[PDB]
């Protein structure tokens, strides 16, 4: 029933992947060989298979039950999966782990703020994500997923670096905890009613200001 859009064929298997998180391998008869499904994974747009042709252990091994009348050993190449929502994963060929890699902003992008005394940089999307990196380490670290469907664009540190702040296209402003990205104010401040367009702190931590696209 569900929408398919991926199709590639490996070493006399066919492989097919779906809008909603089910990936299937077939033999040229269109016979059914065991699938991968229902992980936190969907709309798989990137499939790819290893350069390495698999060497074949069998003395101890983890292979899934194929659906033949008997149901035999089954050893693909290694192969790569990735979603619509920009989520990148590698599978151990033996299935024992579905391992995810970097995970990245879904859609459109807006500019990042640096901590003034620490090698930390914060990135945010339009959608649902603000995340911080140590740009020396090149290491993905702390990040908080934001409430659904709010657009977000503006980001700031206070001059101490102790505070982080972000601006949201639907009339919405948060102050953030430069550690946990807790919503510092028990609710955010939602006084305006359209997109932010700037935010800044004073030299005094006590004061912060924003512009909105209504010229207010």
């Amino acid at each position: 029933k569900e929408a398919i859009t991926v199709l590639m064929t490996i070493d006399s298997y066919i492989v097919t992947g779906d809008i909603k998180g089910n990936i299937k391998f077939y033999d040229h008869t269109l016979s059914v060989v065991n699938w991968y499904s229902n992980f936190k994974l969907g709309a798989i747009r990137t499939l790819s298979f290893s350069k390495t042709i698999p060497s074949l252990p069998t003395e101890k091994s983890n292979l899934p039950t194929d659906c033949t009348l008997r149901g035999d050993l089954f050893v693909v190449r290694n192969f790569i999966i990735g979603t619509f929502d920009a989520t990148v994963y590698h599978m151990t060929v033996d299935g024992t782990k579905l391992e995810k890699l970097f995970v990245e902003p879904r859609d459109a992008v807006y500019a990042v703020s640096c901590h003034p005394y620490q090698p930390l940089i914060a990135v945010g999307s339009v959608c649902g994500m603000i995340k911080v990196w140590d740009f020396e380490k090149k290491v993905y670290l702390f990040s908080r997923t934001f409430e659904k469907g709010l657009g977000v664009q503006c980001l700031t540190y206070n001059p101490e670096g102790a505070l982080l702040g972000a601006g949201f296209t639907e009339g919405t402003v948060y102050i953030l905890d430069a550690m946990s990205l807790e919503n510092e104010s028990p609710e955010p401040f939602k006084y305006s009613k359209s997109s932010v367009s700037h935010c800044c702190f004073s030299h005094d931590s006590n004061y912060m200001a924003t512009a909105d696209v209504n010229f207010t």
Binding site: L30, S31, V32, N34, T65, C67, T68, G71
Partner: protein, 48 residues
């Protein structure tokens, strides 16, 4: 006679073609149904 025979023969032939197409697509529908049932059965083993 010769003409009327030829014409009626051609008409018969045309309907023969109609029947041939009809049965051909009927068997294609059969093949579809079998393919579905194969998939169902192969899946059904998985749980056991």
């Amino acid at each position: 006679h010769l003409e009327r025979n030829l014409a009626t023969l051609k008409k018969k032939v045309i309907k023969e073609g109609e029947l041939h197409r009809t049965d051909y697509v009927r068997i294609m529908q059969e093949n579809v149904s079998l393919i579905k049932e194969i998939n169902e059965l192969r899946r059904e083993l998985k749980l056991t």
